[model samples]
Target: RKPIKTLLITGQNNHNWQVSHVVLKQILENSGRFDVDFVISPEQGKDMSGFVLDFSPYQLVVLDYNGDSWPEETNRRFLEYVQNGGGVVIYHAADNAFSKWPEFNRICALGGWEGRNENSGPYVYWKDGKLVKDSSAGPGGSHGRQHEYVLNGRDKVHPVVKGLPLKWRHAKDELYDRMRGPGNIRDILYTAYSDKETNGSGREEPLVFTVDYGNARIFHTMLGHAGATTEDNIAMQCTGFQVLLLRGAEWAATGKVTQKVPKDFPTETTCSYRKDYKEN
Candidate 1:
């Protein structure tokens, strides 16, 4: 199969991008499915005059940015790219970005922090049978203490999660909860309960899903948070996280996943890891 051309945007994030971006590239490329190119923007609070980029050459755009406003031209081109059926992967803190950019927010479906509030959208979470958009008042984004958690698949038909395990334990990572945004989630792939013991909202928060906006194939996963260094980055090294990332990126880029589930995948109670997914 021809490698899927991918563009990974980074250079500004609250997390350790130095570690996360490298791990992201490794997992995506080591799967033998993607050829990754980077478009690292200028430093946070630096002049963004040269930050404009062309988005027409890539099959998928993975966002790892969360700081500073993008150049106006880059923003326009990005919107056009997605509006014209481009693919995107909003990974981890990428959803915390562009809180004021309505189009970007809609593309992400749900975002957190960056001064987001109920005005940003609704508190979306899994309920009795469907996703609930609660317009109650509160901050936009938050996470409990980092810990190992189980992910429950909510949609079995979506190509991103199809044929995947119904439940699996993830490596230790932040469980993002109480996120707010356009709440445009359509096919939620997985959700996890935030235990109050961890200082989290006692709700089933959507962690992986597809945003319903225009003709774009957008995948968002609030997993694989970057640790301080690559050696300790347990989350992205999880077999489950790496597998879903590869599968999600593939489905986002082509609307289908051709890779078969690997035998190293984690089960309901045990978490698996691929330490090779990142450098030690």
Candidate 2:
């Protein structure tokens, strides 16, 4: 069978793109399921006009960027691609990019930072029994100290979360909370409580979900984070993170997941790690 054609966009980022991008490529391609191509844009503060990217060639676009706005043509192309049913993967800081662009925010479904606030849209999260969009005034995107937490699954029938554990231990990572945006999330795969002791909002934050954009299958994961100086970090190395990511990537690319649920999945109290972002 042919591998999925994937495009990963990364260049400028507040996080470590130098290591993040490389690790991302390995995790996707080494699985022998995807063939990834990288698109590194011009450095931040430099001219980005010539960085025109075509999205029609790849079935999936793994967005890993968070700095420097793309040229208008590039933005238009990306929009058209998604409008035509293209798949997208919104990585950690990727949702933090393009705060002012209305369509991009909608594509993200929910985003944070980059001066995002109530004016952008609303703080989207899970509450009582459904998704909640709070227009309460506040800046978008803030994470408390890194710590291990449990991911509470929300969907049982959805292909992404189907058959996965209802709750599992995730490696120590930033718990992004109070993220405000367009709040156009489609299906919530998982949510985790942002503890107050960690200086978090104490709300159950939506970390894995899909966008409600037209025709596009967008898989968003706000779990993996790479430090500015750290490579192969525990967050991304978590078996839960890698398995879910690979599963999510496949579903986003083709609307299906062919991989079997692994026995190495971490329990609610124990965090498992694939030291190289690969299965043994």
Candidate 3:
């Protein structure tokens, strides 16, 4: 089987995706299963007119971009392409892209420009290579810390986490909470809970998720933050996470994960950990 062709539309004039692109590229290269192409969104400017709408050519479209909203017609065509059979993988603030575009949000299945957590804030907890949430706080401001978030109830057996341990741990990373808009979330992969909070809520927040809308496949993960904790390798593993990410993109592109992660993939105790997919 041929490697999946992937286009990473990114780099909006020195934006965070620029850094994210490097990490993403590393994962793609290390996997050795994807043919990657990167387009700088800023340098290229607004130019979707010549782009064709054929899902058969590319296996996955990684939206590691920011800014430049496509015209309604072009946007519509893009949606049509995905619905007709296409796959998308969104990372980090990709949810913040086109914050005003309804179709984009719907297709991507997430939205939130003003984050729920602060950048490197102090509500997170990381210990012995595991994440734990601090329950003594209210939801306000963007957060970034060694916090362990609660997982949503629907994500116990999703393919993205098929081989992960029950109580997964991360050396350190960002954990978003108190998100609003479209609460239309379903089939969650991970989430954080608030105790004694309003609504008596113990629901999992979305960390990773897959959504099938029409014939399109959507995958999103809210697990990237920059800091000591966010840089851990144990957090990176999380059940073949890098591989799982590619698997999601592949599934979205071709309805399957035919490609397997290489056997000698490097492991990092900082963010390296495995998922068993089955447990008590």
Candidate 4:
């Protein structure tokens, strides 16, 4: 099969865009499944009118942006792109954006910060092999200090994470919690419990999930937080993260996942990583 054409819309963020953007781009390209291109806006919340008008040439659009809102017209075009069967991959900080845009929040299924609240919806997670929708009122987003957490696969039947280990160790990263929104998630792929010791909510948080917006397929992953420099960013190097990203993007683009779990994937007790990824 031919590689999927992907557009990575990013730039203008509080985080280190110099490193985060490059890491994200490298991760997608290294999969050998995505031919990646990017459009960088001058600043966050700036108009993206010319950057993304036509969605015909790309099979998927990976949102790596985390700053400012887009022009109202650009937002409308994006909504139509997904509503008309286009695919979207909402990366880590991407969910924390477009707080005022109801449709964008619904598409992400859940998001954090930017004055998010109960109106954003309930927090969706998996508990005891069942899905849990908590309507408790609180801040929309929070996270503990970066650490290596255990992620449990909630939906083994989902193509994005099928056949992966039930429990595995994720690389050290921020454990996002209390994310609230429309809660229109289709499947909770994996989750991790946040510990209060790390200034977290002490609740199980959805780490990876899928959403059905209109006729579009959406894959949202709360992983992949990179630091200001390459050496400080180890989360993106996790083998499991790389696998999930690859499969998630593929599933979003075609509603099917053809990528296989790598042999060096992390286990419940051990974490695996690529030696060369750090050098990139």
Q: Estimated TM-score per prediction?
A: 0.98, 0.97, 0.68, 0.93
Worst 10 residues of 2 by lDDT: 225-234
> Quick one: best lDDT, which candidate?
1
Q: What lDDT tens digits, residue by residue, belong to model 1 across residues 107-136?
A: 999999899989999999999988998999
Error of 2 at 4 (Å): 0.3
What candidate 1 gets wrong by more than 4 Å, as runs, is: 278-280
Which candidate comes out best when scored by TM-score?
1
Candidate 2, 28-134: lDDT as tens digits: 98899999999999998999999999888899999999888999999999999999999999999899998878898899878888888788888888789787889
After superposing candidate 2, which stretches have Cα over 4 Å from the reference? 228-232
Worst 10 residues of 3 by lDDT: 271-280
Clashes of each: 0, 0, 33, 3
Error of model 4, residue 41, in angstroms: 0.6
- Tell me the alpha-carbon RMSD of every candidate: 1.6, 1.2, 8.4, 2.1
Overlapping backbone residue pairs in candidate 4 total 3
Cα error, residue 140 of model 1, in Å, equals 0.7
lDDT of all the models against the reference? Answer: 0.92, 0.89, 0.53, 0.83
Instruction: List the pairs of residues colliding in candidate 4.
Output: 45-68, 45-69, 120-181
Question: What local lDDT does model 1 show for residue 19?
Answer: 91
The worst-scoring run of ten residues by lDDT in candidate 1 lies at 271-280
Candidate 3 global CA lDDT score: 0.53
For model 4, residues 1-280, the per-residue Cα lDDT tens digits are: 7889998887766567678777777777877778888878867545556554556688899988877677666677788789888889998888998888888898999999888988888987667767788898788999989999999888879999888999999988999999999889888899898999999888788989988677889999999887768666788888888788888999999989887667788999898886345223
